[PDB]
Amino acid sequence: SHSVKIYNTCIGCTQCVRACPTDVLEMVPWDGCKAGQIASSPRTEDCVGCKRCESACPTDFLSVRVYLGSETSRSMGLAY
């Protein structure tokens, strides 16, 4: 499976969460930023590796980061 990690530079704009096509990320509460929410990645078994989240992120060098790893039928985007 791919690995999605969130770093403390997040500003809780929710853009990555909106972008994700397989519901991997969600917003949980946090106190490290003004918006009082950070992104999190509970369902990384469903991550396809598209990197749409990283395209959405507006922080200078992203706060969300997808490290591609071992392939499964879920991550390989197979309908067969």
Partner: peptide, 19 residues
Amino acid sequence: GAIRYPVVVRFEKENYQGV
């Protein structure tokens, strides 16, 4: 004091993301 990156800075040159 809880905020980890409090200062907001604006630059003239946009980065690769376009921000």
